[PDB]
Amino acid sequence: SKLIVPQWPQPKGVAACSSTRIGGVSLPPYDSLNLGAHCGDNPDHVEENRKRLFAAGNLPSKPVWLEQVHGKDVLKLTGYASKRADASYSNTPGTVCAVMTADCLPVLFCNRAGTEVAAAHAGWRGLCAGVLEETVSCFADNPENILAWLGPAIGPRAFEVGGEVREAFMAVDAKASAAFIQHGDKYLADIYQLARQRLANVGVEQIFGGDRCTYTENETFFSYRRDKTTGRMASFIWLI
């Protein structure tokens, strides 16, 4: 399948999907459903892949792509001065929030009532810096009414990092030590657990997903760590 549908108690007024590498037209190293236009692929192929995926996902409009910079800024999708941001927020029907990834954690959010949605691109830098709390801060609803879906990311068996990454996280939130295990001179990091921690700090505990690994599941996902020059997937959410 070209896409995954989040397994969460999705409100009737919300739609969401997350793409795989399967079912497009690109050739290696972008094989096949590469959505990224700035990673060296044949641009005709990328355009075709986007057409295929947007049709498969029944997107009502084109996604509002961001100029992702591995920061913590959120674009409120008001209908831009700048799209330099790593998350977006919408309360407008038909507006599609999207983040593009190939290892960095996508997080999709909505409220139980189905009146607000958001998408965050939470690579370790952005996650550490507070992109998830920034995104949550945009919601009008109460925190216990926010649902968060952890999309396909590089998982804890493959995401090896140096001690400086562990230090960066622990400097914000000491609990972060629980999300690393030592491997020689490095650490294996659980980005999912880090997300759960940082969201729990802001009262968001209804968390779903977190069961995939972009690195390990190579027939299903692109992985920057695995392949360096490769394609991108994306995660999408909208109010119907």
Could you give the CA distance from residue 235 to residue 6 in angstroms, rounded to a whole number?
10
> 148: which strand partners?
109, 207
CA distance linking residue 1 with residue 189, whole number of Å: 29
Annotated binding site: 70, 104, 121
| Domains of the chain as residue ranges with CATH | 1-240 (3.60.140.10)
Distance set, CA 50 to CA 123, 175, 234 (Å): 23, 40, 10
Annotated binding site for Zn(2+): 70, 104, 121
CB within 8 Å of 131: residues ≥ 6 apart: 71, 72, 73, 74, 86, 87, 120, 121, 122
* 213 in Cβ contact with 158 (< 8 Å): yes
User: How would you class 92 by CB atoms within 10 Å of its CB: exposed for 0-12, middle for 13-18, buried for 19 or more?
Assistant: middle
Report d(CA 17, CA 215) in Å as an integer: 20
Query: What's the resolution in A?
Result: 1.5
Residues 6+ apart with CB under 8 A from 105: 121, 122, 123, 127, 150, 151, 153, 191, 192, 195
